[PDB]
Design a protein around this ligand. Structure first.
Ligand code: NAG
Ligand code: NAG
Ligand code: NAG
Ligand code: NAG
Ligand code: NAG
Ligand code: NAG
Lengths: 596, 99
């Protein structure tokens, strides 16, 4: 009869016929990931093509129902999600060109091998070898050689491809009634139709700048301290008034600063909180790691893992004969099937990763009651944030003592808290200006503010202004330095890490306030608190049914992303950095004073 | 995948108690006539169940048997098993033989 009833029946038919197909596609992808064989690749490709064609046909059927005659929020949300053209609005030749460009960028990034000129008999790939060199070397010219050679080869291959990519994506986005591709990415946080809780695409950039203005003093103090320590490590390269050299940040691109913890440790003489040896001595299997994680999740009141999870997951490396992807991934295959694919080692990092992926599994399980097309996070930030809060809680010394992995006579003084907070700042705080600068540069490229001949001159200018990192040698327009990273080269949003980082500490403050913790925020553990788990599960059960602003009101009591929990988390470290920076000069100069 | 189990997904009105609907006529959700072909706004009401052994417990197949007991004015003939106490002789006992 009415349009709304027609849409409701169509959505029921869609969820029914898209659930089995999604389960088949996900199962084919799982069989490829746990068993890399050519028939599994063919089955994955066939299932993906069927899934994409079915989604195209269902979107084509979905567009015939106008949006403004539907008043139910969930039905309107599913119809809005389904009616997106994607690449379908673009012409078939340009769509095929875009797909070919994405596939060839994937092959170039995955199979990119670079080694030193005059010694070409064997070369090293980035993931097996260059990562270890970037993370562990102390030699200036070796890191400079690796960085410049990899950006030379990758940028010179990818620059025309990226020039075509930006034009095709902008054409597709303007064909979809968006200003640019950046507006398309910012449309994930767009809330329309809810009184008071509406969020605009234009408000996101303003909120990011408003939060970053408060991020800036803490990052300036941290950058000054890291600059002083790298000046101690490398005597003549680093200037007191200038930016840091690009190849010395501990990673290939500057994504994380966590590989500089050894060089920038405040108190090396004091011990660490490493619990690896205790698990080796007590012979802790990966199964025991996942059982302890399950014990943590039942302690807070969340549901425990299904029988199918324990039966069907691969929690150990299979062997030489069978090949599997080493990256830890939680899979929501559909129809209540939840699995974790991780090559778990006996390390602290794998234990925290196990907690993070089981948090992903808990988030996936929570919205199982929801309709199929609403089975996602409210935004891209929440999905990662609910795993990062488990990563925060599991890493605390109180959690390690509670589960028996740490000695009960370990002395928790201020120095260990300072160095642990500094390590967490290098991992978490250090990625924020890089993420903000990269996303703002990509938004300005898509918007047309920066012409193609001036992409890099502005970019380094942004990096000096925001990240405080100077180029070793000037780069011309033949280079494509951003596209050497995995996410940007393979069409992935990058603001999810910034939103995840702020939501992580907002959720941490909310759960610690729920758990009635009376000390520092970084000393807080969310185990044994039923009310904290209930407050988490209230947001977790909603999925994508409700706006992210309303979910944030449900958890933290605020209608917008906030920067104060991050500053509260690192406040002892902030005071310590302010004390340590009396002699040194806070802030940097954008000039070429160290080296260019 | 076991697709040998179909359910009715759409009907204009709810079923009466103890009713079986095995009709395979196209459901009309819109004003337009279906004309017997499954196109737009017209769906086939019977849909198959996807049953895999790796599914969760909320999606695994469950066999359901419902027993309906009714009393009508006719003499009741489906009786339960009548437990019999061992026979004791030569003593003054309370006997109940076939009612
Ligand atoms: C992985 O694939 C190989 C070759 O197809 C097969 O022999 C093996 O049984 C598979 N492993 C699993 C766990 O299915
Ligand atoms: C919206 O639709 C869902 C299912 O499609 C239903 O459960 C809910 O009650 C509806 N809301 C309103 C206000 O009608
Ligand atoms: C999808 O594309 C078609 C054809 O260009 C257009 O009519 C429709 O409005 C588009 N949908 C959206 C949501 O922009
Ligand atoms: C999860 O908890 C329930 C109730 O405590 C229990 O019956 C079930 O066996 C548990 N599942 C697993 C896999 O341990
Ligand atoms: C830790 O506390 C002691 C005594 O209060 C003090 O001397 C020391 O400087 C403190 N260290 C840090 C890093 O705050
Ligand atoms: C939380 O519960 C676990 C399981 O009973 C227990 O071992 C642990 O000691 C509890 N934590 C605290 C702080 O009491």
């Amino acid at each position: 009869s009415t349009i709304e009833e027609q849409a409701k029946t169509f959505l029921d038919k869609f969820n029914h016929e898209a659930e089995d197909l999604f389960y088949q596609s996900s199962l084919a992808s799982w069989n490829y990931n746990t068993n890399i064989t050519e028939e599994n690749v063919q089955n994955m490709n066939n299932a993906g093509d069927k899934w994409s064609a079915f989604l195209k046909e269902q979107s084509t059927l979905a567009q015939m129902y106008p949006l403004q005659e539907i008043q139910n929020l969930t039905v309107k949300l599913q119809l809005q999600a389904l009616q997106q053209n994607g690449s379908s609005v673009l012409s078939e030749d340009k769509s095929k060109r875009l797909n070919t460009i994405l596939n060839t960028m994937s092959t170039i990034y995955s199979t990119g091998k670079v080694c030193n000129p005059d010694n070409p008999q064997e070369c090293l790939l980035l993931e097996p070898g260059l990562n270890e060199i970037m993370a562990n070397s102390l030699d200036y010219n070796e890191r400079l050689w690796a960085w410049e050679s990899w950006r030379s080869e990758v940028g010179k291959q990818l620059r025309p491809l990226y020039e075509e990519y930006v034009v095709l994506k902008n054409e597709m986005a303007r064909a979809n009634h968006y200003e640019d591709y950046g507006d398309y990415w910012r449309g994930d946080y767009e809330v329309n139709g809810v009184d008071g809780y509406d969020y605009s695409r234009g408000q996101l950039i303003e909120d990011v700048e408003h939060t970053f203005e408060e991020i800036k003093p803490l990052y300036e103090h941290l950058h000054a301290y890291v600059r002083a320590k790298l000046m101690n490590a490398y005597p003549s390269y680093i200037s007191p008034i200038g930016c840091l050299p690009a190849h010395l940040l501990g990673d290939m691109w500057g994504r994380f600063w966590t590989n500089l913890y050894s060089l920038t440790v405040p108190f090396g003489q004091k011990p660490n909180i490493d619990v690896t040896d205790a698990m080796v001595d007590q012979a802790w299997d990966a199964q025991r790691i996942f059982k302890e994680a399950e014990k943590f999740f039942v302690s807070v009141g969340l549901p425990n893992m299904t029988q199918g999870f324990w039966e069907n997951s691969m929690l150990t490396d299979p062997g030489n004969v069978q090949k599997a992807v080493c990256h830890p991934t939680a899979w929501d295959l559909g129809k209540g099937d939840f699995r974790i694919l991780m090559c778990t080692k006996v390390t602290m990092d794998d234990f925290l990763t196990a907690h993070h992926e089981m948090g992903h599994i808990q988030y996936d399980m929570a919205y199982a009651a929801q309709p199929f097309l609403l089975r996602n996070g409210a935004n891209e930030g929440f999905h990662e944030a609910v795993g990062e809060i488990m990563s925060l809680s599991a890493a605390t010394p109180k959690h390690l003592k509670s589960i028996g992995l740490l000695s009960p006579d370990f002395q928790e003084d201020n120095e260990t808290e300072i160095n642990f907070l500094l390590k967490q700042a290098l991992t978490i705080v250090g990625t924020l200006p890089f993420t903000y600068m990269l996303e703002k540069w990509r938004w300005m490229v898509f918007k047309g503010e920066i012409p193609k001949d001036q992409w890099m001159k502005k970019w380094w200018e942004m990096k000096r202004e925001i990240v405080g990192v100077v180029e070793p040698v000037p780069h011309d327009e033949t280079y494509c330095d951003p596209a050497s990273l995995f996410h940007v080269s393979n069409d992935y949003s990058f603001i999810r890490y910034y939103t995840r980082t702020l939501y992580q500490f907002q959720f941490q403050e909310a759960l610690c306030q729920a758990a009635k913790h009376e000390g520092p925020l970084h000393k807080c553990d969310i185990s044994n608190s039923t009310e904290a788990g209930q407050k988490l599960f209230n947001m977790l059960r909603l999925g994508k049914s409700e706006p992210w602003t309303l979910a944030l009101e449900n958890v933290v009591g605020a209608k917008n992303m906030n920067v104060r929990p991050l500053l509260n988390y690192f406040e002892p470290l902030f005071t310590w950095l302010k004390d340590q920076n009396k002699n040194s000069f806070v802030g940097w100069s954008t000039d070429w004073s160290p080296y260019a | 995948g076991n697709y040998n189990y179909r359910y009715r997904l759409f009907r204009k009105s709810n079923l009466k108690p103890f009713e079986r609907d095995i009709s395979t006529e196209i459901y009309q959700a819109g004003s337009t006539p279906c004309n017997g072909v499954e196109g737009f706004n017209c769906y086939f009401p019977l849909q198959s169940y996807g049953f895999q052994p790796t599914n969760g417990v909320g999606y695994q197949p469950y066999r359901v048997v419902v027993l309906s007991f009714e009393l009508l004015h006719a003499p009741a003939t489906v009786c339960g098993p009548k437990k019999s106490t061992n026979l004791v002789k030569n003593k003054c006992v309370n006997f109940n033989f076939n009612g």
